[PDB]
Amino acid sequence: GSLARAGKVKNQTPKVPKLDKKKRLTGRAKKRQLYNRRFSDNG
Amino acid sequence: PKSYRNYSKTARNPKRPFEKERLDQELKLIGEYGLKNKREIWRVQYLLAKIRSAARYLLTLDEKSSKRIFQGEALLRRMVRQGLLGENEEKLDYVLGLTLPKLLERRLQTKVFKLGLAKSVHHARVLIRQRHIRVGKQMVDIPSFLVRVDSEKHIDFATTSPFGGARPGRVKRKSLKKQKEKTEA
Amino acid sequence: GSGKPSGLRAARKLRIRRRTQRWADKSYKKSHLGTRWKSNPFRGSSHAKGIVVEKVAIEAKQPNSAYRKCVRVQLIKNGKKITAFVPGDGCLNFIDENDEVLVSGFGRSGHSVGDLPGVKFKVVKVARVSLLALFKEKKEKPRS
Amino acid sequence: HGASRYKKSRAKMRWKWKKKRTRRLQKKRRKMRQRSR
RNA sequence: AAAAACCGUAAAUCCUAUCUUUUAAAGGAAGGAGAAGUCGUAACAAGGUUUCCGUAGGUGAACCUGCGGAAGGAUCAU
RNA sequence: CUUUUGAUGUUAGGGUAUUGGCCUAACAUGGCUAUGACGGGUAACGGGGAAUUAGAGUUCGAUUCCGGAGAGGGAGCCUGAGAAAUAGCUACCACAUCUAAGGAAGGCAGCAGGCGCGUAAAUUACCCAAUUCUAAAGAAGAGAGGUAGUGACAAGAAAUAACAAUGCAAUUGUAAUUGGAAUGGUGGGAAUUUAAAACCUUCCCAGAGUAACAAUUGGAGGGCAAGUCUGGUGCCAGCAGCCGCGGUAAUUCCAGCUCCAAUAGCGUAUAUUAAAAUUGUUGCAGUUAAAACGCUCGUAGUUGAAU
Ligand SMILES: [Mg+2]
Ligand SMILES: [Mg+2]
Ligand SMILES: [Mg+2]
Ligand SMILES: [Mg+2]
Ligand SMILES: [Mg+2]
Ligand SMILES: [Mg+2]
Ligand SMILES: [Mg+2]
Ligand SMILES: [Mg+2]
Ligand SMILES: [Mg+2]
Ligand SMILES: [Mg+2]
Ligand SMILES: [Mg+2]
Ligand SMILES: [Mg+2]
Ligand SMILES: [Mg+2]
Ligand SMILES: [Mg+2]
Ligand SMILES: [Mg+2]
Ligand SMILES: [Mg+2]
Ligand SMILES: [Mg+2]
Ligand SMILES: [Mg+2]
Ligand SMILES: [Mg+2]
Ligand SMILES: [Mg+2]
Ligand SMILES: [Mg+2]
């Protein structure tokens, strides 16, 4: 009988926009960046 | 009717998705040889497993048996021709000792890097994909090409490449044009 | 000896015992019983379509406390009635009195899951649009 | 429910009284079905 | 050639009898789940009459009593 | 269980292209069965094969090839070397078309296409050039067959940069700024290809800097790789395969940021295999966890000293 509370919290939260550009690498170049960060400087 | 051309798979999944040590080893190899995904590691593992299975079955078999003689000679010849065994270790026991780096060392990418001719392994991959490389008067643009023994002294630039004695590319000619209409205006 | 015959001509006995004793396994008997085509609303399918009849709320089990939102659906295929859970935060407000919905299993094929008592179905589509694409609220709008 | 009947480790009702109750109820059912034949 | 008769090969329709599957219903009687409900206190300590088995009878309810048995006893012993 | 009305045999005929209870007459009382007959069920066409598996096994096979059966449901028949044929004929049952009301004409489980059914499936296109077949047999025809169109069923290869100078952390990294090379995707035109287009290769012209020519799908307590970061809610809303989280300081809900995984792919539902030595021949367990018949005799079955 108390089904008027549905979707209460999702409608309560204040809204915040996404951030802008910060484009990411893809593919073989992204595997290169990870390899440097985990092993190249750790030695 | 259905077509009579068949097909097959070339890779296989690890069966244990979040094991730390295997994951670190895979990243080791990917970074060392400049690869794209885990799928290439898994295809090489698949191929090596087939080779090792054949070798094991042959080894459990009787000596001076015709099957062993025929198939073992064929397999050893194939391996030495591929450049994986050598000259003094052709005995069907050194097949079981082949490791992942050995096979991974024969790629055209690694070979193009190791023979000077490129400043890195990523440079080596980008050059192959941009139609700059030949293997014996045939132009190859696939970085997983496996180089056989008698083909590794014939790697060189292509005749239709600006790095191999031809006209310059689309950028050089446009800069030279702009310079010309600058100097003749 | 260990309770079995081990002779070179004792195959019939072993075969017949294994045939008779397999019926005590729950999995085998579930998969090989003739009544599954009868006592199963989906009748062996993985998905089904139906018409919404009523919205309800269901209590959770004892240590928990909530009111879970579900619907009652009449299947087009055979006319039977079931209860299906609507997942998401405000997703019950996307459903009207008598719409057409796809429902599927709920992950434990014959069994209830987690906190709801006696619910084994889950809605996936409403009015020919995806519930997930509609909850993302940035992808599609209800087919008016 | 063979030799494991009457096993008591959990504070339940006695086995034989449950048996007696079931037998009484079965007798009533048999009488009801006989009355309709 | 049309058309008749007879022995055959025989769709179809109807009546009767069984078998299989599905299904309605006054009333009767179970099980499972839930909610701070009412009544007592049978079990766990020798649980305040040691606890159980089989059978028979009785009582609002859990249960009580007779006959024979077991220790999984509260005794490995005078 | 079968046998009155052919069930099992014998004798003599009839019939067929031939043998035969295949059918007729007389005669005898046989034939099968716990090593499962006679029945019931199958969301059962059989096989060559497929999936997963160390070795054993378990599950699937409507569907490229071979065999069988059918053309809405049954039964009859002509021609013919070959048919119980169905884009051949005759009749009944059901469905259905035209009509001037007397009558006439039907069969997509062939190729396209439509309705219905449902979770579930493409063009009412071009050609006989190749593979073959039929004929009065180079030369005709063939929705057999081939070619394109639709198509994230499944399968293979493979982009989303690279390199220098300087600046800044430990030779190196790039976290930062500057500059010139390389190159497809894309648009135009050709050489070819093809029955004729089209695709693939090849050549010429124009053509990247926020290279905006801008990668996603699931997750971040444990199992299980990755935050004790910031706001909102307050046993509500919700999440969660399992254990669990949420009652005003939530590592688990709703969001922002940041990280992890796989990656042109990634989630969810149902079924099935390994995991399962939790169906055990290899290879389980039976005092107390589930489980030795109250006890002995006994046929079939299984197993049996030494020479
Ligand atoms: Mg026991
Ligand atoms: Mg007492
Ligand atoms: Mg006779
Ligand atoms: Mg078949
Ligand atoms: Mg079928
Ligand atoms: Mg087909
Ligand atoms: Mg066939
Ligand atoms: Mg039809
Ligand atoms: Mg016919
Ligand atoms: Mg036709
Ligand atoms: Mg007909
Ligand atoms: Mg058709
Ligand atoms: Mg489909
Ligand atoms: Mg002629
Ligand atoms: Mg001609
Ligand atoms: Mg979060
Ligand atoms: Mg299994
Ligand atoms: Mg097993
Ligand atoms: Mg195993
Ligand atoms: Mg066990
Ligand atoms: Mg005994």
Side-chain angles (χ1 to χ4, degrees):
Chain A
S2 66
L3 61 83
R5 280 174 295 159
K8 169 167 101 69
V9 183
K10 179 176 192 56
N11 301 328
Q12 273 199 276
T13 45
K15 183 175 174 66
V16 180
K18 182 64 69 177
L19 277 296
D20 58 40
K21 280 85 182 172
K22 63 181 72 64
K23 187 180 81 171
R24 301 195 172 238
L25 304 171
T26 53
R28 184 267 299 161
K30 177 206 186 157
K31 290 292 179 193
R32 171 193 222 182
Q33 182 177 246
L34 277 183
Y35 177 78
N36 287 335
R37 186 179 294 117
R38 275 187 211 165
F39 302 120
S40 285
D41 73 277
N42 295 349
Chain B
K2 312 205 195 182
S3 87
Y4 288 97
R5 198 190 303 279
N6 57 314
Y7 53 89
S8 296
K9 291 171 142 98
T10 46
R12 183 76 197 247
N13 289 319
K15 152 88 190 79
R16 186 180 277 262
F18 299 112
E19 200 185 358
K20 196 52 166 315
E21 60 265 12
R22 160 182 76 77
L23 191 61
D24 273 9
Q25 276 144 42
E26 278 171 9
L27 192 52
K28 299 288 94 175
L29 286 178
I30 280 172
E32 166 164 357
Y33 291 97
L35 305 173
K36 185 183 206 276
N37 319 300
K38 314 294 180 100
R39 195 190 193 273
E40 292 172 349
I41 309 281
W42 302 344
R43 71 180 69 185
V44 182
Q45 263 159 347
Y46 201 69
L47 194 143
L48 173 62
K50 274 192 190 308
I51 293 173
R52 288 194 64 260
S53 173
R56 287 189 50 203
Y57 167 68
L58 280 185
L59 270 173
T60 189
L61 215 49
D62 178 6
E63 194 79 21
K64 69 181 177 67
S65 166
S66 59
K67 208 177 305 292
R68 174 161 176 174
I69 286 156
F70 188 72
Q71 193 176 330
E73 282 169 352
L75 176 70
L76 281 169
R77 169 189 173 269
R78 185 169 332 126
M79 281 303 96
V80 60
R81 187 162 168 248
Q82 195 69 48
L84 295 171
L85 279 183
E87 85 291 19
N88 63 7
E89 39 189 353
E90 310 150 42
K91 292 177 71 68
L92 210 73
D93 276 4
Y94 301 82
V95 187
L96 294 178
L98 289 175
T99 56
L100 203 61
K102 292 253 193 59
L103 274 69
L104 213 55
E105 185 67 26
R106 304 302 295 189
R107 293 166 53 95
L108 180 63
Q109 197 182 336
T110 316
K111 207 58 70 173
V112 159
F113 172 53
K114 293 293 181 66
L115 263 54
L117 185 63
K119 290 196 171 178
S120 179
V121 73
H122 307 260
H123 199 222
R125 198 182 178 114
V126 173
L127 264 62
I128 295 173
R129 203 72 200 136
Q130 291 176 353
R131 311 162 70 79
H132 287 303
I133 302 290
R134 276 178 322 155
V135 182
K137 66 94 177 177
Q138 164 70 56
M139 183 270 258
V140 179
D141 73 353
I142 281 152
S144 44
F145 183 94
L146 288 188
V147 191
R148 292 209 275 262
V149 159
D150 63 358
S151 298
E152 63 186 1
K153 274 86 70 176
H154 303 286
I155 303 171
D156 177 39
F157 283 121
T159 64
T160 60
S161 173
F163 304 128
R167 67 187 293 201
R170 82 178 70 161
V171 180
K172 279 292 286 291
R173 73 186 70 162
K174 182 174 73 175
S175 72
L176 295 182
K177 175 163 290 180
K178 294 318 288 283
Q179 187 70 351
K180 183 178 184 293
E181 285 84 3
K182 181 54 185 299
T183 199
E184 66 92 18
Chain C
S2 65
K4 302 179 275 203
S6 75
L8 204 66
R9 299 169 176 178
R12 178 173 281 121
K13 171 62 76 78
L14 302 165
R15 207 183 75 246
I16 289 176
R17 184 176 176 87
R18 185 61 49 231
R19 195 173 75 208
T20 297
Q21 286 313 293
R22 269 190 297 194
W23 286 103
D25 195 352
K26 225 161 164 167
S27 306
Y28 174 94
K29 195 168 189 178
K30 164 172 204 227
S31 82
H32 282 90
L33 211 60
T35 67
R36 64 185 195 277
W37 305 97
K38 187 178 74 66
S39 65
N40 191 4
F42 277 13
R43 204 184 153 279
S45 309
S46 73
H47 292 72
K49 270 182 200 173
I51 300 292
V52 173
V53 161
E54 189 189 53
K55 317 174 165 197
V56 285
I58 303 299
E59 300 293 336
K61 290 276 203 68
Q62 172 51 56
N64 284 338
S65 161
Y67 288 78
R68 302 277 149 81
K69 271 71 179 176
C70 314
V71 287
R72 301 264 312 157
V73 174
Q74 196 175 16
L75 295 192
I76 299 165
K77 173 151 76 169
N78 49 32
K80 291 176 186 208
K81 287 185 170 67
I82 60 191
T83 314
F85 171 62
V86 191
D89 196 340
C91 286
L92 190 76
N93 302 128
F94 284 128
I95 302 186
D96 291 331
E97 183 64 25
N98 53 5
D99 291 331
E100 202 200 80
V101 287
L102 283 173
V103 302
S104 80
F106 196 64
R108 287 193 69 187
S109 54
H111 205 283
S112 172
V113 177
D115 214 8
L116 278 169
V119 169
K120 329 166 174 192
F121 295 105
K122 168 177 71 171
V123 65
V124 57
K125 264 159 95 166
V126 60
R128 293 182 184 271
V129 303
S130 175
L131 198 58
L132 183 141
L134 187 61
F135 173 73
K136 297 288 96 176
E137 190 252 357
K138 69 177 194 272
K139 305 198 156 296
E140 270 163 29
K141 301 301 191 284
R143 179 66 179 86
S144 68
Chain D
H1 48 281
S4 161
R5 91 209 181 267
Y6 79 76
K7 177 194 193 146
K8 187 173 273 195
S9 62
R10 210 180 64 247
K12 53 166 79 77
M13 188 191 157
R14 276 192 79 173
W15 157 245
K16 56 159 55 169
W17 307 148
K18 178 188 183 197
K19 197 191 204 178
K20 206 183 184 86
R21 193 146 86 175
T22 285
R23 284 189 185 180
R24 276 166 181 160
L25 188 153
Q26 286 189 131
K27 217 190 282 211
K28 264 189 217 192
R29 285 187 181 139
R30 277 207 303 271
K31 185 185 170 78
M32 283 279 312
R33 263 194 84 169
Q34 187 61 353
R35 158 186 200 94
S36 177
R37 288 202 304 136

